[PDB]
């Protein structure tokens, strides 16, 4: 449901311990991408347009966090 | 244009009920659909909400009155005579 | 002679300090900001709550304490009153330099708590006048 608009909040909501998974969506138009954290009440999501920033961001997610899912 | 000769507001009731009865209605129907002057604000915007009840549209105040005019003439006589009876008592 | 002056009690009619007594301090007719005749009210947001002889003495100290406020109000909103506060607390001394700039308003209020507490209690006027009718007006809550 809810969005996030900046990288300050997205790093907090991932690290918060009841966050289950991070499904990550990519789509061609060009390569605009979405992260979505399924937390407990809400599904938070964070739009990024540049692919090279989004490749850097996937490293910044923690490994001890469980899942990741991708179309493709 | 004036678009009837005589019957005026009671063209409504058409070609029935009989012309004497229709004329009795005409004269007091003409009274009740009138605006009257408000006592309290001044503006001539008083309308009859229900029989015996009148509302000043601009003012917002409601007041009691006649069925079909704001001030029945019998009631105007009592407002005179009670003002007199209060004065002589002192 | 304008009714509003630098030493006159009012009642505020509009805004969240409505029906709250307070003293005018200084008057204007516009600036670059504000295209209207405003004035610096220095009033009483919570009046001191009423008191018994048969309370304990520490509770009487607390109940008399005042929450002031400071505000530029428009002239239309304030209402003048018969009474006037010029010969008792001296309202120029009561900070001209500090207003909105520097956000010293908080600093300004703590000035008024010292004054309005010492005025309400021991409110007898110097030399002659025993109670003063002006000052005992401000103590009362304007009960609507």
């Amino acid at each position: 449901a809810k969005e996030i608009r900046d990288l300050r909040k997205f790093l907090l909501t991932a690290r918060r311990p009841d966050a289950k998974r991070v499904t990550i969506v990519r789509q061609h138009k060009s390569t605009v991408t979405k992260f979505k954290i399924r937390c407990s009440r809400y599904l938070y999501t964070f739009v990024v347009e540049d692919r090279e920033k989004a490749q850097k961001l996937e490293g910044s997610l923690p490994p001890s966090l469980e899942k990741v899912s991708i179309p493709g | 244009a004036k678009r009837t000769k005589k019957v005026g507001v009671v063209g409504k009731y058409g070609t029935r009920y009989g012309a004497s009865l229709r004329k009795q209605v005409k004269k007091i129907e003409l009274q009740q659909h009138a605006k009257y002057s408000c006592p309290f604000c001044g503006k001539m915007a008083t309308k009859r909400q229900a029989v015996g009840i009148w509302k000043c549209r601009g003012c917002s105040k409601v007041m009691t009155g006649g069925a079909w005019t704001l001030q029945t003439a019998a009631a105007a006589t009592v407002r005179s005579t009670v003002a007199r009876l209060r004065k002589q008592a002192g | 002679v304008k009714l509003l002056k630098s030493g006159r009690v009012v009642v505020v009619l509009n805004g969240r300090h409505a029906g709250k007594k307070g003293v005018v301090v200084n008057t204007w007719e516009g600036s670059k900001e504000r295209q209207f005749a405003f004035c610096l009210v220095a009033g009483i947001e919570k009046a001191p709550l009423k008191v018994h002889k048969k309370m304990p003495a520490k509770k009487i100290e607390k109940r008399m304490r005042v929450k002031p406020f400071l505000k530029y109000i428009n002239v239309n909103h304030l209402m003048p009153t018969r009474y006037t506060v010029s010969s008792d607390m001296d309202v120029k001394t009561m900070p001209e330099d500090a207003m909105r700039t520097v956000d010293d308003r908080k600093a300004a209020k703590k000035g008024l708590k010292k004054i309005f507490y010492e005025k309400f209690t021991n409110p007898v006027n110097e030399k002659v006048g025993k109670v003063s009718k002006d000052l005992l007006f401000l103590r009362k809550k304007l009960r609507f």
Partner: protein, 246 residues
């Protein structure tokens, strides 16, 4: 045999009054200490069309004397009475329109409406639209008082009984003709079902005393005694006099 619709009306059932959207029984304020040793300031908050009557009701807001709470009585509105007006009920109130004086305080020639028969009656006489009861004259003491009713008749009444000074509102609402059956129907729908009345001559001789016959006539005197039973008493009951007046 068969019971006449005169007789069926007391039985209740389908001839009961249609009370549902009527807005409370209209009364004066119940006789207090405050009303009889001084006065009590009312404020008129609302003026209401009560259905099934010509008069308006004023809704009036008094302060209670004993508790903190705020009471609300509904009177029948004397005309010349507005929303925002102070009414003053009680013994030592001024003789002006609105106010509720005892009758002994009112100087004779006064128009009064909504008058109490007894003391503390709450107000029986002269309540219909346009009507009033005029004061004629007092006793020597001020104990009892003469009144002239909207009928004509003259009534001795206790002076500590009270009423509103002035005429009841909705004045002169019979001077129009209802042109339509529809306008008669809408009148009697919010009262009891008394309408439309069938003529008893149209009925058969079962259903009414007049009905029957190969011509449509009454056949015995329309005039009937006071002493006659339930179901004889139809037509002109106990009549002193008949025919056109003068």
């Amino acid at each position: 045999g068969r019971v006449i619709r005169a007789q069926r009306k007391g039985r209740g059932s389908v001839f009961r009054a249609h009370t549902h959207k009527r807005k409370g029984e209209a009364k004066l304020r119940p006789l207090d200490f405050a009303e009889r040793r001084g006065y009590i300031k009312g404020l008129v908050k609302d003026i209401l069309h009560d259905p099934g009557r010509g008069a308006p009701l004023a809704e009036v807001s008094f302060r209670d004397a004993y508790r903190y709470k705020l009471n609300k009585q509904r009177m029948v509105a004397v005309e010349g009475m507005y929303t925002g007006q102070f009414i003053y009920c009680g013994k030592n109130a001024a003789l002006t329109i609105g106010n509720i004086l005892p009758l002994n305080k009112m100087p004779e020639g006064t128009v009064v409406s909504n008058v109490e028969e007894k003391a503390g009656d709450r107000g029986t006489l002269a309540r219909t639209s346009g009507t009033y009861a005029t004061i004629v004259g007092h006793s020597d003491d001020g104990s009892k008082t003469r009144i002239r009713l909207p009928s004509g008749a003259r009534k001795t009444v206790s002076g500590y009984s009270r009423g509103m000074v002035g005429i009841v509102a909705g004045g002169g609402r019979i001077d129009k003709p209802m042109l339509k059956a529809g306008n008669a129907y809408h009148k009697y729908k919010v009262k009891r079902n008394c309408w439309p009345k069938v003529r008893g001559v149209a009925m058969n001789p079962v259903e009414h005393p007049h009905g029957g016959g190969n011509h449509q006539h009454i056949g015995h005197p329309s005039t009937v005694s006071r002493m006659a039973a339930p179901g004889q008493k139809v037509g002109l009951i106990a009549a002193r006099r008949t025919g056109l007046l003068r």
